[model samples]
Target: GLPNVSELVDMVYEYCRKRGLYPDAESYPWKSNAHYWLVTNLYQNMRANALTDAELRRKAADELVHMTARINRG
Candidate 1:
């Protein structure tokens, strides 16, 4: 399956917004880039056999925090 990084970010952004953790999705610039690379890296590592489930989860969480929860609009 193709990774929908933007959709993923939007979902997280919505959750964060509901929780008052962030105001809005796409209000940030760094988020999409963060998501894209995080996924791209995930895919790379996964394909390279370098990603464990835990490692994948970790990257996912980190990307979410950085991309959706940081309130980064820069």
Candidate 2:
């Protein structure tokens, strides 16, 4: 079964932390924005795709990497 929104948020949040895209501090604009972008995109993709959980995770990771790069570039 696919992870729910809460789990998806946690996964994306961890990815943001691991990539240093978001700060450790709470209540920051960048952190909120990054989380919003990552989680929303990931959730959308999860709904659109028909892949298994493992495959979804792999895709999510790849997408996170690309998204982080774009975020960093801007």
Candidate 3:
């Protein structure tokens, strides 16, 4: 079964963290924005098509990385 929203949030946070994309999950200024959009986009994409849990995570990971890069650039 897919994990709950909070768990997914942490997983996405960790995914970005491990990649050196962000310093800390909870402390990052983008935490809430990332979590909200990550979950929203994940669910939206999944609902519109067929995607396994792992695939969903992968997609979210990519999005998080992009978001991190934006912050880094800004």
Candidate 4:
């Protein structure tokens, strides 16, 4: 079985932090918008059943990478 959303959020958050992709200063609120965004997206996906557990883990990290790139680009 998959881990709960909070656990999943922490996992992805840490992954991004390790890669220096999170705590994005470019985003408003300094270091938390990205986390909040992750939480919201993950919760929504959990509720919607939009992705399988394995895919959710993969996609969450990937999406955070993309989000960081976009923030850095602009």
Candidate 5:
């Protein structure tokens, strides 16, 4: 069977994670790909620092945690 949305979400998130999106970044291919903006937003948000370093780090952690926890809440 084909993978479900959760699987796809996980796959996208995983790809993003490896592409310097997540903390402790990893290397992955961007390859001129156009994904949903939200995906890129997630990556950028992970590295974002609109706030203080400590605050941004905490927010990033909280945001990802919230993303994982609430992806299905809608």
Candidate 6:
């Protein structure tokens, strides 16, 4: 079977984490070559610093965690 969305998301996350310099943000071009929904989420996340760093980090960690669970469940 083709790999699913969660797999892709994890791969993307893992690929970037290796070289990231966060505690601020990455210089990634969120506008290009990404799912529209995720791109919108990324843009909005930056627009206002809408969530605290801890909150944002947890949100992403939770997503990856939950996504992994669901994929494994299937």
RMSD of each: 12.1, 10.2, 11.1, 10.4, 9.6, 9.0
By summed lDDT, which 10 consecutive residues of candidate 1 come out lowest? 21-30
Predictions in order: lDDT: 0.50, 0.58, 0.59, 0.57, 0.46, 0.46
Q: Model 6, range 1-74, lDDT digits (tens) per residue?
A: 22244544444454346425544334443333333334235335634576654565555555545555765787
lDDT per residue for candidate 2 within 1-74, as digits (tens), equals 23444566566555545544445423334345555565656655765775566766776677667766776777
Candidates 2 and 5, the one with greater TM-score? 2
Clashing residue pairs in candidate 6 are none
**Model 4 C-alpha lDDT per residue in residues 1-74, reported as the tens digit of each score:** 23344465665455435535445423423245666566556655755775666767776666667677767877
Clashes of each: 0, 0, 0, 0, 0, 0
Candidate with maximal TM-score: 3
- What does candidate 2 score on TM? 0.48
* Pick by TM-score: 2 or 6, better one: 2
Best by lDDT: 3
Misplaced by over 4 Å in model 3 are: 1-31
- Model 1 ranges with Cα > 4 A deviation: 1-35, 47-49, 69-71
Q: For model 4, what is the alpha-carbon lDDT of residue 50? A: 58
Which digits, one per residue and each the tens of the lDDT, describe model 5 over residues 15-42? 6546655453332443322233334554
lDDT of each residue in 1-74, candidate 1, tens digit only: 22244555444334434534445433433345554455555555554776666665666666656655445554
CA lDDT for candidate 4: 0.57
Candidate 5 segments whose C-alpha is farther than 4 A from its true place: 1-50, 72-74
In order of appearance, the predictions have TM-scores of 0.38, 0.48, 0.52, 0.49, 0.30, 0.36
- CA lDDT for candidate 3: 0.59
Better of 2 and 3 by TM-score: 3
lDDT score, residue 50, model 6? 65
Candidate order by TM-score, decreasing, is 3, 4, 2, 1, 6, 5
Which pairs of residues collide in candidate 5? none
Q: Is candidate 3 or candidate 4 better by lDDT?
A: 3
Q: Which candidate, 1 or 5, would have the higher lDDT against the true structure?
A: 1
